[PDB]
Design a protein around this ligand. Sequence first.
Ligand SMILES: *[C@@H]1O[C@H](CO)[C@@H](O[C@@H]2O[C@H](CO)[C@@H](O)[C@H](O)[C@H]2NC(C)=O)[C@H](O)[C@H]1NC(C)=O
Lengths: 424, 404, 398, 383, 404
Amino acid sequence: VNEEERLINDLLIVNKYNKHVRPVKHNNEVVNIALSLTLSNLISLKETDETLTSNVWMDHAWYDHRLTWNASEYSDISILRLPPELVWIPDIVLQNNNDGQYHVAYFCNVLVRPNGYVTWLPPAIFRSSCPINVLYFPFDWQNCSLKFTALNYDANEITMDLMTDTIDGKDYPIEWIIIDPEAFTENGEWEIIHKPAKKNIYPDKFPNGTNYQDVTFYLIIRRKPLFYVINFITPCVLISFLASLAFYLPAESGEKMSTAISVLLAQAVFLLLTSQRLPETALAVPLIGKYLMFIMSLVTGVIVNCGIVLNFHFRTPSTHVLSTRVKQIFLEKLPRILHMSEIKSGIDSTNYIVKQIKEKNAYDEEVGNWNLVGQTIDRLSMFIITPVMVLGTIFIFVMGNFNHPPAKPFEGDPFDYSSDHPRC
Amino acid sequence: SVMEDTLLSVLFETYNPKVRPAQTVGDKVTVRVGLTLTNLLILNEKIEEMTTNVFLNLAWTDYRLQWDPAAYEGIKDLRIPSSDVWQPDIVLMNNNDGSFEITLHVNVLVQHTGAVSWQPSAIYRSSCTIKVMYFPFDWQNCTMVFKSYTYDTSEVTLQHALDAKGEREVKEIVINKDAFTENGQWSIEHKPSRKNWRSDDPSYEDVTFYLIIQRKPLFYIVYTIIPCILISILAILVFYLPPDAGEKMSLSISALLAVTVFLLLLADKVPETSLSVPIIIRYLMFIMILVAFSVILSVVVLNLHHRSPNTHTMPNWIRQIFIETLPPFLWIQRDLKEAVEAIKYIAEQLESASEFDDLKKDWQYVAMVADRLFLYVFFVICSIGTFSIFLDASHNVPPDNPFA
Amino acid sequence: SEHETRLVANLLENYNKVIRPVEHHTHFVDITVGLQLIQLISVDEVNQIVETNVRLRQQWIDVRLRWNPADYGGIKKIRLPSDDVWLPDLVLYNNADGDFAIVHMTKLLLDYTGKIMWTPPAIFKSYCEIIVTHFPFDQQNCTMKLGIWTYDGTKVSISPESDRPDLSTFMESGEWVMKDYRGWKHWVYYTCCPDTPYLDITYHFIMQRIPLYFVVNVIIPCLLFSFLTGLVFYLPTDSGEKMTLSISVLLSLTVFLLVIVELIPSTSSAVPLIGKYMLFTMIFVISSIIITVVVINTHHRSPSTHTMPQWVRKIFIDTIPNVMFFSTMKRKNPDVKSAIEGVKYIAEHMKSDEESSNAAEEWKYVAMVIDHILLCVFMLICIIGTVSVFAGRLIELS
Amino acid sequence: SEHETRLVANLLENYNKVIRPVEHHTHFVDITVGLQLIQLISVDEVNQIVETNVRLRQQWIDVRLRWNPADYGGIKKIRLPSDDVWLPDLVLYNNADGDFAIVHMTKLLLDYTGKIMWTPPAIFKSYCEIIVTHFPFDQQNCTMKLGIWTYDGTKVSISPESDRPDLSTFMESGEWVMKDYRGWKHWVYYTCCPDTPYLDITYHFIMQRIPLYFVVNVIIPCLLFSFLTGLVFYLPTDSGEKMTLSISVLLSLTVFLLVIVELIPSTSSAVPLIGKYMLFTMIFVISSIIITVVVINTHHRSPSTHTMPQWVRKIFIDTIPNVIEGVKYIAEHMKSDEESSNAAEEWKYVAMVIDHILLCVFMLICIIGTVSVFAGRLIELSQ
Amino acid sequence: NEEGRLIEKLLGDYDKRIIPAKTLDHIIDVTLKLTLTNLISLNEKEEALTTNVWIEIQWNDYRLSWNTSEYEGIDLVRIPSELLWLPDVVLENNVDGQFEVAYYANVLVYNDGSMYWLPPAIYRSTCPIAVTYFPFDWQNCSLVFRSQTYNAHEVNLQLSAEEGEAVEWIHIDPEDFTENGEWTIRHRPAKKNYNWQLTKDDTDFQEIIFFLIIQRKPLFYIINIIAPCVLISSLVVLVYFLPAQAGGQKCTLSISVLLAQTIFLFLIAQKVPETSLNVPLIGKYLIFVMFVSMLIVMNCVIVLNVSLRTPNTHSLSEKIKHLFLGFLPKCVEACNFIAKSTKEQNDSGSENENWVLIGKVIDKACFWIALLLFSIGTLAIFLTGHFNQVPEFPFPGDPRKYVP
Ligand SMILES: *[C@@H]1O[C@H](CO)[C@@H](O[C@@H]2O[C@H](CO)[C@@H](O)[C@H](O)[C@H]2NC(C)=O)[C@H](O)[C@H]1NC(C)=O
């Protein structure tokens, strides 16, 4: 018959294997819980909820002096399998999580070897809390982390370490997140750049407390901004170019104000859209948000200038008198600077008609000078506003594109935490 | 065998977690409660619910869980699963949803003297009344109430949790600097803990962790207040476009449409409570009514501009009030004989047309003076309104004494 | 305390969870059921579901759970987990998207005389017919029905604790005021088992909506647009802009239609007051646009192809302006002969132009008088409509 | 039946559910695994997750659960709850946002020879690698990997029931047509243990999206907006509504940009074909607005400020169209006004000619762009 | 209490994992009867129908029988469902993973062994949407109850019988039933269906189907959506009466009605199902009005081009002028130069007036055509919607009425 039944019975029922007891011969000893992580795929980093949903394969490894047997005494059984409900397991609990799901999601069988070495690989779905730095959104990189703390025991009872492999006869500790290239697919919006793994010890807390030890896995992920470039950045900058060209419309048509108004409305609509994609945190304004505010205040100034030009275009002689200084500056110096290109009743009635024609012609010349003033201030406003906004947009987007995570994950550490360069 | 197993066998051979640990009949169990806020997740003002990730510190003395460490192998403390020892069910009495108990169920820490220190963790969802007034430049008084659901004062006695030094007592929420990540929207101003009683019911004991939190209004002042200020600037400009441009009403109605769009967007964010009106909604309504009055007065100015002698006759009072007194106070001032018969006729027509033009230009002057007066009045009114609203908002500082 | 361990071990030696707590099977256990409402969570009008956080309080006397206190050190009251004792299967009849019975199963109280006072918490997502006729000033009558499912009156009877539900610790909701609240116990005979009576308690809560939130958010902008729609008739047609104002306020009313439709349930049992007012202002703005097109037409009526009828001229130039009192409306050589002929020709052209302009001015005058009449009648219509659709419920409240 | 009760009691007197159902530990249990898809719930291409209501079919032989029917009244088949027998721990390897293994734990058939036949219902949320290159006329090929999580080869063997998944009881979905489906079983070896293979089954589904919904809710309004922009130039620049129409079409396309943001997934791996089309028409309307600004400026070009160059006149009038003292004073003033009006007439003629050119060019560009972005995928689908 | 010892004796030797068959090849008749009480909602987005029902399951168990005279006349005990064998009748066509009932009420074990289990349940049964005639559309939603474990060779699903007449309908008691107000129960039939493609010993050979031919009440949608949309689309008829002038607003009004149609499209898209099988009737009406309004805009730009055809740009051929005007039946030389210029401008103005008249004739003819087209399209679409009556018989090939 099967030889595993007698061995499992001997290990558990005959030996009185208590599940709720640490696997140590003495109480003063410690249990070394080797730990590792394997990211199957990054599901989504929901910005609005500040939640990182990941599908990981937690890897535990410890020693149990009760789970040992002689291989030759049981017909050469090299390995064993046991469900978690029957063996002592360290409850490594994800401390930071937005939902109530603290534990792993499956509780798969553990594997026990005759030397006592026990490995456990339960898959899990963890929705951790990631404080999102929105400073350079959308050309931004995050620093989401997972904090694994053993809350059931203190650091004087178990010590959490990092699992070590053997390469060329020397042990190299796995200080990174294990990713199998064949079994992992890149997320549709996020790309992993750095995946450091660290063990933190807090000296200001006592060892007998439950907060003395900590194992943290970091995921420095960079957003691929292609979708936002296609759908948000490009339409916004192209619509802002219409605000730039609004000065090219003439004052004669009743469209000078309408195009600027419609461009401002489009900018406000994009502001309405982008308000629903980023958290309401007040640490800093997003890059796209502050660019939107800059271009919106600029197009508000554009509309103010359009109103000023429209006022100066319709200034009749009956309501305003053309000042001499304006007649100099906005008509002579600026255009050359900017390179802008019973017969008594009959004769009395004829004289009156000619006088009225002369008055109408003088009125027309005065309003023509006003129109030229409007065109000149319009050209100056264009040459002031369009280059400053083009330079502003280029500057802010170059600053966004140059925002890259540093080569070293930690600034005070020459180590790079790369799977291809292990140390020690 | 490891002696921990034998000690666990000895302790629980007759233990029952269904009985109070009162040593003598009618005695009370002094239960110490406290909080360790690790993360303030979110404060959903739509449903008046606060979600927090906390470490509920507990400490009660059980007389049955006693042993002599010298008798055993020097064991001075033990970790026991929370479902095996008696437990006072400190639940969140003011939860918004049905989640009463604790989530994680970590192991308790039983020492040889009998003192049990249990520190379970949970994602609690409490409910607090939102002070909708002064939103978003507002401070909230959201509270969490912790007391035994089943036992009352005749059976337990709630107290305050101690510190690392046992000689000191803590009357505030403990924050661990290593683990606490600051919420990006709320700032913890005060966090006192005080047992409030009931005068009308002696059999009631409570421990409430008041949490005075201040909203950081930068998001709302960036996405709503600044666009509303820009729209107000546009609305003031409506009283500066000439009537001949044919764009005054277009600009004003576009500003009104923008204001209503921003009003409808905030409907997803402002609370649904009808007790009062938040200061941002009050400001939105003020701006909307101002823009509506701008639309009405620009309609009036257009009517005054397009009036003519053949359709209106100018009353004397409007002349005396808009040509005489107000322009000083607004800096505004100023065979063959048949051909002879025909030229006389066309000259008389030109004279009549010029008189008509003079009268309609007087109408235009009245319209322009009224437009400038509306410009100044609206500028003063909007500036005073914004200053008063922002002064009221800026003085909404939470009091330095939290009253615990 | 070992006294309490002795008591709890002795009580549950032979206790059976699934057996009725009566001395003889012909009897019935008198359960005193009461309800206290801690807080009203939300009222979902689109689904007709009202969610309440209540503490259902059941009291019944169990004969198998009595002891003499002097035998056990003087203990009079203890606590037991609810899963260890027989429980009534109180179930919300009109449940919707929720739990039908108690699921949290907190501990209870056990007096030495066998009296049990169990007060578990619950969240009752009840299903009440949301009557929406007077929204948002509506007065909903939402109720929850509690009864014993498997048993009937002759086996396990229930009785209300007090004629009104407890509201001593009621947390004041931000949008509902409890006008009234009362509980009645009915005696109904179901079709499945008509031979024996079935008991239930029907707690009804007369709630009315606090309307300030909806008045500020929705009704005030609608009133503003209804005020603005009448203003189009005061805007002169010479600007060529009244079409913009009318279509813009039309679009605004369309957006408010979009936001109002989602608020009310889709039930056709009644048309809400806000819905009737919204349809009224939609009809108002549609008719204002139509008559704006009419007055634009009569503003641009070319006298070349149109002659002004006598009757409309009389009515709109001779009587209506006289009626108005508050407005300011009025009440030898070839070259020489070629030059002479040119003067005659330009004079004739000027005379024809002046005749055409005078006729056009008369058309403008007719259009403006029509606009004034429309302004007055539309202001009166909007005021009367607002009063008719809202003042009825306002005086009904008073 | 009393026979059934005594048989079930006898079968589980000493049955152990944590022991592999194999005669000897060196051998392996042969587990036949099939699948039948009941109904595809939805395809969440935003998170790259497909949820399918399936009934996983597992059958294996247990040597401890056999009995002679003649000893128990002739019973040949019984049913037991799945929690009372050893079960293979089939885990969705690419599970995302859902459960990993069977959670419903339904009862299973048990033949008298030990032939266990288990068909538990489950909902699988696989990590479907979404390819959006030809959205919405796209073809998704994504799998659902199944395998024994803890055991491996030479301990528990898994083999497919048939080369194709069962689709007899499939409910026809509203947005997908099941083109092809097949299953394969792999053998993965590790250098640490080269002698022990690792087994799994990869069930791939070739699915084509039914594009009627996206065509009627997205493509038709986009085509209408692309046609309206080409009709702007016929409208003369004298009614004052040309730029009004242009900015109104721009605002309508912004509203439809809101709609399309609500609809299309946020994947930066590749630009969707509908994304390329909407970017094309957005570039088109931006360019149309720019050139309408230009032609409006040309229309109101006062002759005093700008003098007409020779090349513009040559290209827009010749090639494309073929393809007492006061009396003298007012006479001179009217002559000057007539000269200015003739020059403005030349400017208006240039505006009208360039309007015709832009009308023809823009409509041909719209047709060519729509054909290049749609007819290629339609040709690929037809062939 | 006799009930205690009776229940103790009944369940003393009782395995809840064994189907009750008194002998080999003995089937058990499981009878069903659905009692609808509250039709919660029909979610078009998720194609799920949520119902609150009292499913009545009756079978016979030979083990749960006793004799009344031996237990002081008791003939009805009540046993919780968790301690008894069940037929495992679940809702097969469930959208979520909810197969079983939501409460597990106690059963009524009668004297002779007849079982009466009546558990309430919240069932979300999937239902394909007949979107074609939206919103005046009647739906055909079904609930499938089959035993998910036992095949048709072990249990025999049937329908309940009151007095010998089969209950082939969903029983509704007006004592505790309220109308949904949005869906009306027009037909409520029920029938046992077989799947002959599967053999008898297959699990899914037999099932019970409760149909619900629910017709949507259209008054709310008519008031809120259909009438406002047909009122908006009525305004493009008025466009042809606006002048073809710069001060007029033909194009502005047309594109504003088009924007209103776009807002309607964004509205109803959030309400219609996402199924790609067909296009909803309201969607067809939206497409029709958007296409006809694009034709309105095209005619607007055509008439604006025609009425502004200056003689300096276009030429007026006499043939087209005949075609459209026939459609009505349904040191002194300065003065000479001035006269010549006046004659030239009068000729150009007369030709422009002729062009304006051509545009007016186009406006009248296309106005009548567009009015007729819009009216006939709206009337045909809405008459198709109104004539979408529920079929008189629940099953078209069956003369039975399936109503008590
Ligand atoms: C954990 O160890 C620390 C350090 O020994 C203990 O802290 C001591 O607490 C006592 C009682 O309050 C004080 O008198 C000592 O001064 C503390 N020591 C220090 C260094 O601060 C603490 O009690 C231990 N905790 C447990 C549960 O054993």
